Structure 1
Amino acid sequence: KHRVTLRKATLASLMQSLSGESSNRVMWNDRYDTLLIARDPREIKNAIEKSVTDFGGLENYKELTGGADPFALMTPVCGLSANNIFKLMTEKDVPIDPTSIEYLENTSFAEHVNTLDSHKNYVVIVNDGRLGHKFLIDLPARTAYIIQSDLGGGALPAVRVEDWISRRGSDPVSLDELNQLLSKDFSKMPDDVQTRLLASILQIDKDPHKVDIKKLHLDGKLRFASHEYDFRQFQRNAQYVAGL
């Protein structure tokens, strides 16, 4: 099969489009209760204009809101990226709210993968309380891939989703290594084991030195949720966003 080649092309063409106004806005809107592909680039733009008008103009909006021009192309934080890309992959005609879906708390990653169906595609959304980090694990029909973004500030360095995708988005990651990360046990692992796993799974250069386990919240809660997806449908949804 040629799923991986197509997946790479699909993710590529999608990422390239994101420097385009309408594509960026539809991709990284944070309303999760309607179909992502139903997001209208002019509706969103009107909403921003309105919001700015309400704050007495752009100058004043920026002054009160931190300095951000809300018209600018967005570099998504990890939650916004994970949520939206999850939406894009799983949605057909029924809105999926990734913030409202049920998450698993008392089952390990190995437990769950073993129960998933073999000829089906799944994407897993991970909320890692130890890293303070959301990211996706893609499981096409075993082999896994990481989709993520990161503004930094925690154990891991900043990484734009575009860069991550381009350099590591098709980099198969070990299920085995993945289980060791996604485990209550991970918190009490030696500094170098932790560092090594983080770099290996989540750092763009596989580099221990860019990781800082002193920023881990060791009493963190690990939660994740998986969802089946139609691969062709994922391509559909991606093509739509890229085509704006």
Structure 2
Amino acid sequence: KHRVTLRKATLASLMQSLSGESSNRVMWNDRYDTLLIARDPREIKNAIEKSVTDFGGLENYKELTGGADPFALMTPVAGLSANNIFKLMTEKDVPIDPTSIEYLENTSFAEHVNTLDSHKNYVVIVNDGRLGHKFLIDLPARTAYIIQSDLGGGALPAVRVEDWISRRGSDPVSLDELNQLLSKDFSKMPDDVQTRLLASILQIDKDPHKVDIKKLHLDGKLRFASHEYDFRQFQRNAQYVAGLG
């Protein structure tokens, strides 16, 4: 119960560094075939400069993207956060490409977790076709945490990763409730059951009224994959990102 203090201090350190231009662009970059720690800020900035120049300059670019300045300090949508925190957590010395990971489809979350060694840390990347979402489930060496952000177009309201970590990042989540939600039967459940499950696991203030199930894809596909990780490794990767200044 002393590592959870470290886990929080690491996540807090990481989220705060993200006010840094360098830390912001390296954390949330989208090159997956490379080690996250191999990411060079200056290089990443030249490639944006390249893009902008190629399109006729900043004003003209901001016209195309509909107002979005590629240099701004960003906050990631669910996919980009999930993919990137995934790398940051699992990588040591070999690039892991969340794009090309094989997912389990014909396996319950409940029966999958039972195969997992309890003396190891796991991170579950969840690609949820019912919510149109993608988030992470941290499984320290059972205890479970959610790492997510959300654009807000779905049943869940928009949430910035920094705010999610800060309010819900070190708040464990019911193992069994995750089993209910990460079930193919979830689509069949009573409206209020769905609503409270979503509220309890994925809403920042655990509030059923902030959830709108009408926006669910009842036929969407649930898919997930897990991966073990060294806590030391994740710490160190975090330190790299947080130390860019």
Is TM (by shorter chain) over 0.5?
yes
Q: Distance in 1 between matches of 2:153 and 2:228?
A: 32
Deviation track 1:213-234 (CA, whole Å, cap 9, x = no partner) reads 0000000100000000000110
Using the TM superposition, give the Cα deviation of residue 160 of structure 1 relative to its aligned residue in structure 2, in angstroms: 0.4
Q: Distance in 1 between matches of 2:177 and 2:81?
A: 23
| Aligned equivalent of 2:20 | 20
Deviation track 1:87-140 (CA, whole Å, cap 9, x = no partner) reads 000000100001101100000011111000111100000000000000000001
The secondary structure found in structure 1 opposite 2:106 is coil
What root-mean-square deviation, in Å, do the aligned CA atoms of Structure 1 and Structure 2 show?
A: 0.6
Using the TM superposition, give the Cα deviation of residue 183 of structure 1 relative to its aligned residue in structure 2, in angstroms: 0.5
Residue 229 of structure 2 corresponds to residue 233 of structure 1: no
Deviation track 1:138-164 (CA, whole Å, cap 9, x = no partner) reads 001001000000010100001100000
Q: Distance in 2 between matches of 1:123 and 1:129?
A: 19
The secondary structure found in structure 1 opposite 2:114 is helix
Q: Distance in 1 between matches of 2:51 and 2:153?
A: 29
Using the TM superposition, give the Cα deviation of residue 32 of structure 1 relative to its aligned residue in structure 2, in angstroms: 0.6
Unaligned runs of 5+ in 1: none
Using the TM superposition, give the Cα deviation of residue 84 of structure 1 relative to its aligned residue in structure 2, in angstroms: 0.1
The secondary structure found in structure 1 opposite 2:100 is coil
Q: Distance in 2 between matches of 1:66 and 1:27?
A: 24
Using the TM superposition, give the Cα deviation of residue 75 of structure 1 relative to its aligned residue in structure 2, in angstroms: 1.2
The secondary structure found in structure 2 opposite 1:84 is helix
After superposing on structure 2, the runs of 4+ consecutive aligned residues of structure 1 that deviate more than 2 Å are: none
The secondary structure found in structure 1 opposite 2:98 is coil
Q: Distance in 2 between matches of 1:29 and 1:171?
A: 27
| Aligned equivalent of 2:37 | 37
Q: Distance in 2 between matches of 1:105 and 1:28?
A: 27
Q: Distance in 2 between matches of 1:118 and 1:217?
A: 34
Q: Distance in 2 between matches of 1:192 and 1:65?
A: 39
Using the TM superposition, give the Cα deviation of residue 3 of structure 1 relative to its aligned residue in structure 2, in angstroms: 1.7
Using the TM superposition, give the Cα deviation of residue 64 of structure 1 relative to its aligned residue in structure 2, in angstroms: 1.4
Using the TM superposition, give the Cα deviation of residue 199 of structure 1 relative to its aligned residue in structure 2, in angstroms: 0.4
Using the TM superposition, give the Cα deviation of residue 177 of structure 1 relative to its aligned residue in structure 2, in angstroms: 0.3
Q: What is the number of equivalent residue pairs in this alignment? A: 244
Q: Distance in 1 between matches of 2:225 and 2:47?
A: 31
The secondary structure found in structure 1 opposite 2:123 is strand
Deviation track 1:22-79 (CA, whole Å, cap 9, x = no partner) reads 0000000011110001100000000000110100100111111221100001110000
Q: Distance in 1 between matches of 2:94 and 2:212?
A: 40
The secondary structure found in structure 2 opposite 1:223 is strand
Q: Distance in 2 between matches of 1:188 and 1:234?
A: 38
| Aligned equivalent of 1:118 | 118
Using the TM superposition, give the Cα deviation of residue 201 of structure 1 relative to its aligned residue in structure 2, in angstroms: 0.2
Using the TM superposition, give the Cα deviation of residue 169 of structure 1 relative to its aligned residue in structure 2, in angstroms: 0.3
Q: Distance in 2 between matches of 1:21 and 1:87?
A: 20
